[PDB]
């Protein structure tokens, strides 16, 4: 968010309108990722192997 | 009977019910139930793969309209 | 990458120094969430070995 | 950060590529120090299992 | 006298006698010494928070002086 924040105190303007899909999607993809829970050697469990 | 309606669920169960739905699918077009090697699994994920390289490349074209606009002009 | 690449060409320059920053440690974070997925190990199965 | 913070504002400016990769690396250090208090434990008593 | 004296001691026995002091000192305020929670500790430590936070503002201020000093004019 501060990324953002910065270019946009800085008078660039290039993120409005439809320039804001990329941060708006990268927030998404961080979601995505810290979401999957636990995998590991005694949590083995996992649709691979159920 | 039981399971009628609209109750609750769980992860479990939601996994479970796929797993009938890809074996019951494969009866009906190979007529056997074996599953040593399950193809219908592959089929359906090279179709995303596909879905998902058309979209990278829809990214890609928009990052270049931001680059090098054709409104450069005089 | 994408992100970053689209403010150079608006010629705001907002990075180095102080703006350089915020996406030179975000970008540890991701790889540091990659690691973890990895988790786990001593399985040592292996062409080489069967 | 208030060290680095108090030198622009003196107008020396000797931060930027050469200088800041001091600051840059000196930064990991710390979180490396901290991260190491991390291996207090492998267990969980957390309330959604009790 | 067994422990007279102004002999060497280790790290063990400071905090030996630490825990001493703890429970007598409750002995004298509350009269019971099963110490379910010990009291004292916390609102020692509470103490020791408001003198540090007091130390954040204040060495606050002083970085505050340095990016825009009085004599800056025009």
Redesign the interface.
Known sequence: G??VA??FA???H?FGG??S???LF?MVG?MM??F?GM???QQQMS?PK? | GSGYGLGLSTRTQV?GYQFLARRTAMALTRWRVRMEIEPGRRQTLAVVASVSAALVICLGA?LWS?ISPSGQLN
Chains 1, 3, 4 share one sequence.
């Open positions: 501060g990324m910065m270019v800085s008078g660039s290039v439809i320039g899909i990329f941060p990268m961080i990722m810290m999957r995998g590991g050697g649709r159920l | 996994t928009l931001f």
